[PDB]
Structure 1
Amino acid sequence: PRTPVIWLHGLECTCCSESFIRSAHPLAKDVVLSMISLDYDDTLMAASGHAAEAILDEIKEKYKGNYILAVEGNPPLNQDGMSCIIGGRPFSEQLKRMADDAKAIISWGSCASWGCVQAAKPNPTQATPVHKFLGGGYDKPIIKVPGCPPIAEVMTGVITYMLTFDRIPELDRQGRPKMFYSQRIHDKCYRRPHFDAGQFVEEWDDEGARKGYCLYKVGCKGPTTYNACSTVRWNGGTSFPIQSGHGCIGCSEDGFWDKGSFYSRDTEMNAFG
């Protein structure tokens, strides 16, 4: 029998579900048919309404302490939580109830990990990441898998690790698997030789743009951003933001929307500053 997974959806754009199904290896079809039991998931599931809620109830009982709770999106605290209504009730109530009896939580993406776009100033809904919502006292692991969205093969790589090796991957201080989040983009970037030579894109579609020069001066946040984009890359290893000519915007880091303009130059670059 296949590990039960409950995949809840809070305030979100659905980019994390979308990324997941892009996985080249394993294929999403094989994850769902043969690896996990995806027992609740708004995007894909047959059931709606009362029949959907009843699945919650049942899984929760039958597999008490034995399901993984995956969370896409996040709970709002303003509007009495009714800026995200599920079954006529605040999404936060759904999240809390299912967290209570999960084995472990996966916080998918920047929404669940940190807050993402809806939490950017002035955060009208008081959108709150999962770990902050559940608080200090929550006693099960919360695996943060950030990015807007995360890379597909990172998402399925976390799940296959857990299924193959029978443990939670080692996490950094922020709760992110060292499997994928223990280097910055800039620590593994193929444009680094240009950075080092002072060879930059200065203006869009200039000489340097056409030669693949470093994107630092046009706002690349790779120096401060931890992710697997420069190593694993995106969409079956096809590209990543920098390869296609736009700087990193910092999308796996807490608070990236309010760090500064995406075209502002990244900080803390000098060891004497």
Structure 2
Amino acid sequence: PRTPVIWLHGLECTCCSESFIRSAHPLAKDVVLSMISLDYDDTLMAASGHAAEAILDEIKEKYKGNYILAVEGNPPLNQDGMSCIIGGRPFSEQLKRMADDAKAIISWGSCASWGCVQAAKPNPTQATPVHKFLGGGYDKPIIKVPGCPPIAEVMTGVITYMLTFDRIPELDRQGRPKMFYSQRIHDKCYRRPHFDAGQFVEEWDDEGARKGYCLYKVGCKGPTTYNACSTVRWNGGTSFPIQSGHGCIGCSEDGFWDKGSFYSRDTEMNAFG
């Protein structure tokens, strides 16, 4: 029998669900038919309304302590939580109930990990990442898989790791799997030789742009951003933001929306600053 997965959706844009189904290997079809049991997921699921709710009830008891709770999006705390209503009740109540009997949590994406766009100033809904919502006393692992969205093969790679090797992958201090989040973009960037030579895009579509010069001067946040974009890359290894000519915007990092303008130059560059 296949590992039960409950995939909840809070305040979100659905990019993490979309990314997941882009996976080249394993295919999403095979993950759902043969690897896990995707027992609840508002995006793909047959049942609605009362029939959907019933599933939650049933899984929760049938598989108490044995389901993975995957969370996309996040709970709002403003508007008495009714800026995200599910079954007539705050999403936060759904999240808490299912968290209580989960084996482990996967915080998909920057929304569940950190807050993402709805949490940017002034955060009208008091959108709150999963780990902060559950607080310091929550006693099960929370695996943060950040990015807006994460890379597809990173998402399915986390799942296949757990299914193949029978353990939670090693996590850094922020809860991110070292499998994918233990280097900065700039630590494995093929444009680095240009950075080193002082060869930059100075203005869009300049000489440097057409040669693939470094994007630091046009705002690349790769120097401060931990992700697999420059190694695994995106959409079956096709590209990543920097390859296609736009700097990293920092989208896996806590607080990236408020770090500064995407076209502001990254900090912490000198070891004598």
Fold-level similarity (TM above 0.5)? yes
Q: Secondary structure at the match of 1:231?
A: coil
Q: How does 1:209-228 map to 2 (within 5 A)?
A: 209-228=209-228
Q: Secondary structure at the match of 1:193?
A: helix
Runs of 4+ in structure 1 over 6 Å off: none
1:163 and 1:110 map into 2 onto residues whose CA distance is 23
- 1:202: Cα distance to partner? 0.1
- 1:232: Cα distance to partner? 0.0
Q: Secondary structure at the match of 2:227?
A: coil
2:60 and 2:255 map into 1 onto residues whose CA distance is 33
- 1:125: Cα distance to partner? 0.0
Task: Give a deviation string over 1:219-238, Cα, whole Å, max 9, x none.
Answer: 00000000000000000000
2:154 and 2:31 map into 1 onto residues whose CA distance is 14
Tell me what 1:169 maps to: 169
1:181 and 1:249 map into 2 onto residues whose CA distance is 16
- 1:35: Cα distance to partner? 0.1
- 1:169: Cα distance to partner? 0.1
2:268 and 2:161 map into 1 onto residues whose CA distance is 34
**Percent identity of equivalent pairs:** 100
- 1:77: Cα distance to partner? 0.1
1:47 and 1:259 map into 2 onto residues whose CA distance is 41
Task: Give a deviation string over 1:236-273, Cα, whole Å, max 9, x none.
Answer: 00000000000000000000000000000000000000
Q: Secondary structure at the match of 2:164?
A: helix
Q: How does 1:63-142 map to 2 (within 5 A)?
A: 63-142=63-142
- 1:53: Cα distance to partner? 0.2
Task: Give a deviation string over 1:24-81, Cα, whole Å, max 9, x none.
Answer: 0000000000000000000000000000000000000000000000000000000000
- Paired residues in the alignment total 273
1:39 and 1:141 map into 2 onto residues whose CA distance is 20
1:10 and 1:223 map into 2 onto residues whose CA distance is 31
- 1:182: Cα distance to partner? 0.1
Q: Structure 2: 5+ residue runs without aligned partners?
A: none
Q: Secondary structure at the match of 2:249?
A: coil
1:111 and 1:198 map into 2 onto residues whose CA distance is 35
- In the superposition, the TM-score normalised over structure 2's length comes to 1.00
- 1:90: Cα distance to partner? 0.0
Task: Give a deviation string over 1:72-124, Cα, whole Å, max 9, x none.
Answer: 00000000000000000000000000000000000000000000000000000
Say what the alpha-carbon RMSD is for the aligned residues: 0.1
Q: Secondary structure at the match of 1:167?
A: coil
- 1:144: Cα distance to partner? 0.0
2:172 and 2:150 map into 1 onto residues whose CA distance is 17
1:133 and 1:270 map into 2 onto residues whose CA distance is 36
